[PDB]
Amino acid sequence: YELLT
Amino acid sequence: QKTDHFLSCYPWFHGPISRVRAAQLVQLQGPDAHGVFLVRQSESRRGEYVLTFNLQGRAKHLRLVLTERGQCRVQHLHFPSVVDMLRHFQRSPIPLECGAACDVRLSGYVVVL
């Protein structure tokens, strides 16, 4: 699952 | 579910499709489909949702949490609705942790059957 910065 | 009934009016909502199927749906047209997305239920976190999208041919998956009133939370970001979240990412890039080579705005979507 992608993580935002 | 109750929350998933209002999402079911949208052409880009695919409900309970698997991660793998959603990936292949958005990857079908290759890098020509950069930015193409769909929204589905999460299979690993029941009740949560996922934005699956094409980033230069590869599928990415971003968790979406819907509140009781239908507000949409994407980690630190908050949006009044799922639709507002989609429209936002159509006109500003998704701030993914992989930064530079990971520049993407949402374009079209995979229409549910």
Numbering used by the authors:
A (entry chain B): 5 to 9
B (entry chain A): 325 to 437
Per the authors:
The SH2B family of adaptor proteins, SH2-B, APS, and LNK are key modulators of cellular signalling pathways. Here we present two crystal structures of the LNK substrate recognition domain, the SH2 domain, bound to phosphorylated motifs from JAK2 and EPOR, and biochemically define the basis for target recognition. The LNK SH2 domain, unlike APS but similarly to SH2-B, adopts a monomeric structure and binds its target sequences in a canonical linear, extended conformation.
The LNK SH2 domain was then co-crystallised with a 12-mer phosphopeptide corresponding to JAK2 pY813 and flanking residues (designated below as +1, +2…. and −1, −2… relative to pTyr). The crystal structure of this complex was solved to 1.9 Å resolution, revealing that the LNK SH2 domain adopts a typical SH2 domain fold comprising three central β-strands flanked by two α-helices. In addition, there is a short helix similar to that found in the SOCS and STAT proteins located just outside the SH2 domain boundary on the N-terminal side. A leucine in this helix (Leu330) begins an LSxYP motif conserved across all three SH2B family members and inserts its sidechain into a hydrophobic pocket on this surface. The pTyr of the JAK2 pY813 phosphopeptide inserts into the canonical phosphotyrosine binding pocket of the LNK SH2 domain, formed by Arg 343, Arg 364, Ser 366, Arg 369, His 385 and Arg 387. The phosphate moiety of pY813 forms hydrogen bonds with the invariant Arg 364 and the highly conserved Arg 343 along with the backbone amide nitrogen of Glu 367, and the sidechain of Ser 368. Glu 814 of the JAK2 peptide (P + 1) appears to be a key determinant of binding as it forms a hydrogen bond with Lys 384 of LNK. In addition, Leu 816 (P + 3) inserts into a hydrophobic pocket common in SH2 domains that is formed by Leu 386, Val 398, Leu 401, Phe 403, Phe 413, Ile 418 and Leu 420 of LNK. In both, the phosphate group of pY813 occupies the canonical phosphotyrosine binding pocket and is coordinated by an invariant arginine (Arg 364 in LNK), however in LNK, Arg 369 and 387 are involved in a hydrogen bonding network with Glu 372, and do not interact with the phosphate moiety. The LNK SH2/JAK2 pY813 structure suggests that +1 and +3 residues contribute to high affinity binding.
